[PDB]
Amino acid sequence: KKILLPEPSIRSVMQKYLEDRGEVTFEKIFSQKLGYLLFRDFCLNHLEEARPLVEFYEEIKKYEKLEVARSREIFDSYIMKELLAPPDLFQPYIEEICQNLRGDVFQKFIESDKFTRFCQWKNVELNIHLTMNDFSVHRIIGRGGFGEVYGCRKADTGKMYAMKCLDKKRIKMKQGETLALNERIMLSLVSTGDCPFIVCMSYAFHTPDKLSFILDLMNGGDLHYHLSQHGVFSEADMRFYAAEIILGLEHMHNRFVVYRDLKPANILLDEHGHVRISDLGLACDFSKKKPHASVGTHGYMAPEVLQKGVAYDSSADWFSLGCMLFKLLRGHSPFRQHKTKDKHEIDRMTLTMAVELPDSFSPELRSLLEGLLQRDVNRRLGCLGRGAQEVKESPFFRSLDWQMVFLQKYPPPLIPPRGLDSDQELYRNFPLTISERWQQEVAETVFDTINAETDRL
Numbered sequence: 001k002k003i004l005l006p007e008p009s010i011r012s013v014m015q016k017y018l019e020d021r022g023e024v025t026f027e028k029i030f031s032q033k034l035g036y037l038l039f040r041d042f043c044l045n046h047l048e049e050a051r052p053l054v055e056f057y058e059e060i061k062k063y064e065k066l067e068v069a070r071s072r073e074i075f076d077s078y079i080m081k082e083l084l085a086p087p088d089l090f091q092p093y094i095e096e097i098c099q100n101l102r103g104d105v106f107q108k109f110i111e112s113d114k115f116t117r118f119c120q121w122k123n124v125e126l127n128i129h130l131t132m133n134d135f136s137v138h139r140i141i142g143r144g145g146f147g148e149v150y151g152c153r154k155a156d157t158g159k160m161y162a163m164k165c166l167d168k169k170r171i172k173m174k175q176g177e178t179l180a181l182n183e184r185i186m187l188s189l190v191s192t193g194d195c196p197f198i199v200c201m202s203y204a205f206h207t208p209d210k211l212s213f214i215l216d217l218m219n220g221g222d223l224h225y226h227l228s229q230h231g232v233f234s235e236a237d238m239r240f241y242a243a244e245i246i247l248g249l250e251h252m253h254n255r256f257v258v259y260r261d262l263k264p265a266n267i268l269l270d271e272h273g274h275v276r277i278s279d280l281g282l283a284c285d286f287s288k289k290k291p292h293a294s295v296g297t298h299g300y301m302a303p304e305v306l307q308k309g310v311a312y313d314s315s316a317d318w319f320s321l322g323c324m325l326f327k328l329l330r331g332h333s334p335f336r337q338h339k340t341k342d343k344h345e346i347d348r349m350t351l352t353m354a355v356e357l358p359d360s361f362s363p364e365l366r367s368l369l370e371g372l373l374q375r376d377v378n379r380r381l382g383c384l385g386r387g388a389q390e391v392k393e394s395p396f397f398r399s400l401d402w403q404m405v406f407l408q409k410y411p412p413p414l415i416p417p418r419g420l421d422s423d424q425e426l427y428r429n430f431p432l433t434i435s436e437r438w439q440q441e442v443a444e445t446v447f448d449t450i451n452a453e454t455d456r457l
């Protein structure tokens with residue numbers, strides 16, 4: 001069930017289609033992964049059209065004593081970094097190269113076979129109509145109120161995914177349409193930018209009787225389950241999870257989304273032990289209007305979320321992180337003392353209770369927790385103006401390189417062990433394919449091999 005590119009004859013209609021939408025510009029095509037890759041290859045076949053690139057690639061062949069794959073790597077790693085797609089002496093020279101690249105070389109690209117190939121891939125993208133036959137479904141890996149989550153392979157590329165499959169009957173029966181759709185909106189806002197610390201969405205589709213989210217596969221269970229098996233974590237182990245989560249929150253806050261349900265059961269591990277924030281059903285967009293409602297899990301909600309009538313924003317999440325990091329070190333939320341099932345008492349504690357930190361805690365850790373758990377939003381870490389940057393700058397993360405955190409170069413502390421009619425109208429607009437995600441999927445699976453096969457035909 002693999003991919004078949006349409007024949008080159010679609011070029012005229014496709015080129016015109018995109019021109020009418022003003023999408024045949026350097027900024028539009030170059031910022032797409034598949035556009036970048038094909039434009040890169042065009043440049044590399046016709047280096048003469050970019051004066052500085054000829055001499056450079058002539059010198060590298062002599063320096064490395066080569067026998068094509070290097071050309072691509074050097075373009076991606078070195079050339080792109082130096083040109084970027086604090087004042088620099090070479091600024092006018094960077095502009096000259098880039099102006100030639102986005103003008104005369106782009107134009108010649110538009111007129112070449114390589115743009116015909118971009119039109120073919122782009123046509124396939126606009127023809128995505130996902131059903132359950134496009135996936136091969138394996139075992140259950142998660143359960144919830146309206147449905148469950150399965151492991152699966154998408155047939156045409158072979159990429160493994162998680163398929164969150166909500167049952168429409170059960171949604172109707174429990175009167176939770178608004179929240180199922182909220183998850184779809186929230187995922188849509190968050191799943192751009194390619195972030196490694198959030199369980200993002202690639203596709204959404206629906207059947208007669210099921211809503212389906214295709215999501216990043218997280219195979220290794222959640223931090224709640226692992227905390228009960230491992231026991232509490234040291235400061236060194238918790239730092240790893242904290243750093244990765246702080247970057248997940250930064251990403252969400254940058255897109256004006258408060259998450260509101262930050263807690264260990266909502267932190268999933270992959271098979272390597274790296275983590276992502278999952279379940280955005282309770283998250284809220286705060287770009288237009290700030291939410292007031294008390295939403296979350298009781299030992300994890302911030303004072304401003306609980307206080308009656310007070311508006312709140314991303315500030316909530318930093319407090320929730322404070323509660324959650326304490327839970328990883330101590331086995332319980334700070335404001336749930338003796339495994340209480342008294343929600344009123346937990347909330348009173350959240351506002352009034354002085355959190356007693358043991359001597360074993362380092363002063364650096366105390367600084368962090370006392371910062372995150374500030375009850376006034378005006379004095380809390382993360383809320384003084386500069387967001388996640390203020391939290392990264394804590395002395396608990398003194399020795400971390402945040403670039404390496406982002407790139408996932410730090411070793412994880414725990415490696416999981418291997419092994420009616422009107423109602424259907426509500427779910428129109430539910431189908432979505434996030435372009436960036438599909439292109440990334442194609443790039444990393446079958447792009448090269450389909451291009452070679454097509455080139456032969």
Ligand SMILES: O=C(NCc1ccccc1)c1cccc(NCc2nnc(-c3ccncc3)[nH]2)c1
Nearest residue numbers: 142143144145146147148149162216217218278
């Ligand atoms: O509708 C739901 N929840 C609604 C709700 C929430 C809170 C209280 C009342 C109702 C619902 C439905 C299926 C599952 C889950 N949560 C588990 C989960 N979420 N993502 C994964 C996952 C597993 C592997 N890989 C990637 C993702 N697993 C919640």
